[PDB]
Amino acid sequence: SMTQRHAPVIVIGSGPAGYTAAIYAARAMLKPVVIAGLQQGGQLMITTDVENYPGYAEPVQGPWMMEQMARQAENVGAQIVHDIITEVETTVRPFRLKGDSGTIYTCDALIIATGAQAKWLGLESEQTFMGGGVSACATCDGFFYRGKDVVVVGGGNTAVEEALYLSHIAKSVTIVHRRDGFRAEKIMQDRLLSRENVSVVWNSVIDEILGTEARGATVTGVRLKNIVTGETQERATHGVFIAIGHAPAVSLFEGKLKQKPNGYLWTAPDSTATDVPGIFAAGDVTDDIYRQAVTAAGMGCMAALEAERWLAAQE
Amino acid sequence: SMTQRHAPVIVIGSGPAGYTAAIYAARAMLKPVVIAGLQQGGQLMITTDVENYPGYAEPVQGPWMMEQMARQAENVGAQIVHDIITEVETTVRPFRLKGDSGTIYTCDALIIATGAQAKWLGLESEQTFMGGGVSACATCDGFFYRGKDVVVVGGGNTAVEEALYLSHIAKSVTIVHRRDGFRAEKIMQDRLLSRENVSVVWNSVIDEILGTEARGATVTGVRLKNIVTGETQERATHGVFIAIGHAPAVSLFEGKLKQKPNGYLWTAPDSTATDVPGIFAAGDVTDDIYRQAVTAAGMGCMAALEAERWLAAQE
Ligand SMILES: Cc1cc2c(cc1C)N(C[C@H](O)[C@H](O)[C@H](O)COP(=O)(O)OP(=O)(O)OC[C@H]1O[C@@H](n3cnc4c(N)ncnc43)[C@H](O)[C@@H]1O)c1[nH]c(=O)[nH]c(=O)c1N2
Numbered sequence: 001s002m003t004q005r006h007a008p009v010i011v012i013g014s015g016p017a018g019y020t021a022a023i024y025a026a027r028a029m030l031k032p033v034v035i036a037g038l039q040q041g042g043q044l045m046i047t048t049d050v051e052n053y054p055g056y057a058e059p060v061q062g063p064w065m066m067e068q069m070a071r072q073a074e075n076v077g078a079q080i081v082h083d084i085i086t087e088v089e090t091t092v093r094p095f096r097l098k099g100d101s102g103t104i105y106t107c108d109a110l111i112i113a114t115g116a117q118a119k120w121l122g123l124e125s126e127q128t129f130m131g132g133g134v135s136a137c138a139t140c141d142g143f144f145y146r147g148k149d150v151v152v153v154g155g156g157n158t159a160v161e162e163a164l165y166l167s168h169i170a171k172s173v174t175i176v177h178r179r180d181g182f183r184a185e186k187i188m189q190d191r192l193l194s195r196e197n198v199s200v201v202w203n204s205v206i207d208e209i210l211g212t213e214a215r216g217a218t219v220t221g222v223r224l225k226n227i228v229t230g231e232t233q234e235r236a237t238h239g240v241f242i243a244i245g246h247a248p249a250v251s252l253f254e255g256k257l258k259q260k261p262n263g264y265l266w267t268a269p270d271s272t273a274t275d276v277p278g279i280f281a282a283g284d285v286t287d288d289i290y291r292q293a294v295t296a297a298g299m300g301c302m303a304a305l306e307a308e309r310w311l312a313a314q315e
Numbered sequence: 316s317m318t319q320r321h322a323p324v325i326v327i328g329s330g331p332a333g334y335t336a337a338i339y340a341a342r343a344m345l346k347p348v349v350i351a352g353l354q355q356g357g358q359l360m361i362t363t364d365v366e367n368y369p370g371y372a373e374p375v376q377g378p379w380m381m382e383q384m385a386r387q388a389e390n391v392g393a394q395i396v397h398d399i400i401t402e403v404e405t406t407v408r409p410f411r412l413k414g415d416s417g418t419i420y421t422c423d424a425l426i427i428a429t430g431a432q433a434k435w436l437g438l439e440s441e442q443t444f445m446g447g448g449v450s451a452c453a454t455c456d457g458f459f460y461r462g463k464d465v466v467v468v469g470g471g472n473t474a475v476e477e478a479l480y481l482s483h484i485a486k487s488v489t490i491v492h493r494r495d496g497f498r499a500e501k502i503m504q505d506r507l508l509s510r511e512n513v514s515v516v517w518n519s520v521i522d523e524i525l526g527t528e529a530r531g532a533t534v535t536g537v538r539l540k541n542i543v544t545g546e547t548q549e550r551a552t553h554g555v556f557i558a559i560g561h562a563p564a565v566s567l568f569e570g571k572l573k574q575k576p577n578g579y580l581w582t583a584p585d586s587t588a589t590d591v592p593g594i595f596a597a598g599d600v601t602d603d604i605y606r607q608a609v610t611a612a613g614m615g616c617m618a619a620l621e622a623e624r625w626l627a628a629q630e
């Protein structure tokens with residue numbers, strides 16, 4: 001493989017943040033290279049039903065949308081490279097990245113768009129029912145559960161937020177959490193629990209998600225286990241939302257870039273600037289608040305424009 | 316017309332910010348109404364060539380894109396109303412808006428997405444050559460002027476920023492400004508003027524943009540006038556970028572919502588919250604930094620999610 005390769009901008013990640021950064025950087029003649037990573041196209045690759053990305057009259061599949069973005073990025077002059085970054089040197093100029101290929105990449109500005117994957121319980125039945133009643137995004141799928149009974153799993157701020165959102169849409173929400181209480185801001189927790197259509201099953205986990213045969217397989221219930229006693233119980237439900245948190249993809253940057261208390265990369269207000277000039281971060285690796293494709297794309301744009309302005313200031 | 320009409324969320328504006336807010340609000344079952352305003356579809360209605368909105372492999376026309384967003388918004392349950400808001404009462408609950416129709420609209424949360432139109436010189440030749448060498452957005456059109464000679468008109472921070480961006484792409488940039496010096500941050504101005512491919516014509520205006528007959532009409536030069544002496548001169552050019560600033564659409568909110576020193580609506584960091592709880596602002600009415608369709612759409616999303624969270628907190 002190539003020993004070493006320089007681009008003015010390198011984007012790490014090929015989700016909507018990375019592709020958008022690449023589109024804008026390429027149109028500014030910064031000849032960007034996108035390092036695609038392990039999942040070219042990012043987390044939208046695992047959904048077949050996108051309805052809230054603005055600009056498509058009808059629902060689209062995630063892979064189809066991300067193919068359009070990839071094509072767009074290469075059409076305007078970005079180059080997509082199939083590699084995974086394994087190390088980043090943040091204290092040298094040009095910045096230096098090592099690929100799993102062995103190639104050393106160098107760049108004058110770096111845009112980090114590595115994402116923050118939803119965490120899952122680790123059940124085979126999560127896969128079986130994925131998109132047929134199992135979701136990790138209430139914003140995305142809540143609408144389909146209008147007047148239906150759903151379960152939310154988790155007990156942190158994410159679960160409280162997802163349950164509160166769903167309580168306004170679903171007929172009922174049952175939250176299942178392995179501890180005896182929420183580990184979330186008290187005002188939010190009180191607000192959620194006071195809703196008449198919300199109940200909680202404490203000290204419990206999902207033992208299995210139950211449903212029909214894959215003709216798709218559709219959720220019809222859950223088996224819960226009390227983790228104190230081991231006793232199980234089964235209940236009917238129409239949907240299960242897994243809300244146990246997200247894992248920002250920050251292992252390259254730990255100890256090198258400022259992080260927020262929860263692990264997400266810190267960026268400046270109304271900006272993608274990290275605490276190292278010339279390194280920008282866009283999308284779900286920094287955004288723990290909105291977590292949408294369009295917000296991720298918007299940040300990608302911001303990062304390219306900021307990178308361009310910064311590079312001009314270095315000349 | 317109707318005397319009075321309530322929606323949980325009302326969005327003022329039907330550009331990418333307004334439509335995106337409507338899409339997300341409708342999918343949260345907040346039954347939003349969008350007040351379309353004078354230009355349904357917003358400022359993208361006047362461009363036939365969009366290439367940097369992520370998710371379209373090939374270039375699209377602005378009207379076509381904005382029709383897709385309008386259709387999407389109504390498909391997911393938003394309602395578009397053809398009216399213009401003429402007054403907003405920001406100190407009452409529910410918020411009250413008056414339409415030019417005479418209808419009184421009321422809402423529990425308000426999302427402002429009224430935009431900030433580029434200002435133009437007021438020349439007939441600006442219209443003639445629109446999209447054939449006259450532009451008000453270097454980010455949008457600069458790419459096409461790779462190795463070409465262009466003119467930038469203006470002398471504020473916007474003109475300095477647009478010229479600096481273009482100096483990296485175009486063969487040359489000639490800035491034309493009616494004063495003897497820039498009215499921009501000194502570090503930026505020094506950086507621009509030191510570029511070897513940048514020149515300036517001070518104390519002057521564009522008297523006319525010159526070019527070919529509309530077969531489209533294509534720019535080939537400009538006539539400049541010194542506004543001290545009245546003397547004119549003519550020069551060849553391939554493109555003219557009008558960079559005299561933008562006009563945030565804030566006349567409804569002057570004296571009622573916090574504004575930034577330049578007139579744009581103030582919003583909180585990493586947020587669309589204005590200084591009145593339950594009133595959010597998204598898109599170019601608040602964003603004087605990025606000014607793109609995708610950033611505007613991203614803010615629309617943010618406003619809907621924040622509005623939804625806020626409404627839940629009121630219940
Ligand atoms: C099941 C499901 C369904 C939905 C959603 C999530 C989930 C889990 N979302 C949320 C959406 O997926 C999320 O907001 C975006 O994917 C975030 O985009 P990013 O570009 O930030 O990261 P994203 O996670 O998409 O991409 C990260 C990229 O970084 C790369 N990467 C990571 N480490 C790397 C390394 N070391 N080297 C190189 N590359 C590396 C990966 O390969 C990947 O390409 C969503 N949103 C929405 O708006 N509408 C919707 O319908 C849905 N639906």
Ligand SMILES: Cc1cc2c(cc1C)N(C[C@H](O)[C@H](O)[C@H](O)COP(=O)(O)OP(=O)(O)OC[C@H]1O[C@@H](n3cnc4c(N)ncnc43)[C@H](O)[C@@H]1O)c1[nH]c(=O)[nH]c(=O)c1N2
Pocket residue numbers: 327328329330331332333350351352353354355356357358359361362364365366367368398399400401428429430431432433450451452455564567597598599600606607608609611
């Ligand atoms: C010539 C040209 C070309 C481009 C661009 C600009 C210009 C001038 N842009 C920038 C882009 O147009 C801009 O970023 C967005 O239109 C901003 O979207 P908003 O939704 O914020 O406002 P936008 O201006 O689009 O919409 C404002 C809406 O508010 C409404 N409104 C105002 N007052 C009202 C009232 N009192 N009552 C009701 N409604 C009211 C209007 O009717 C309108 O529908 C662009 N960006 C990009 O990303 N790619 C590109 O190629 C281009 N190209």
Ligand code: NA
Pocket residue numbers: 266267268269270271272273585
């Ligand atoms: Na930030």
Ligand code: NA
Pocket residue numbers: 270581582583584585586587588
């Ligand atoms: Na803000």
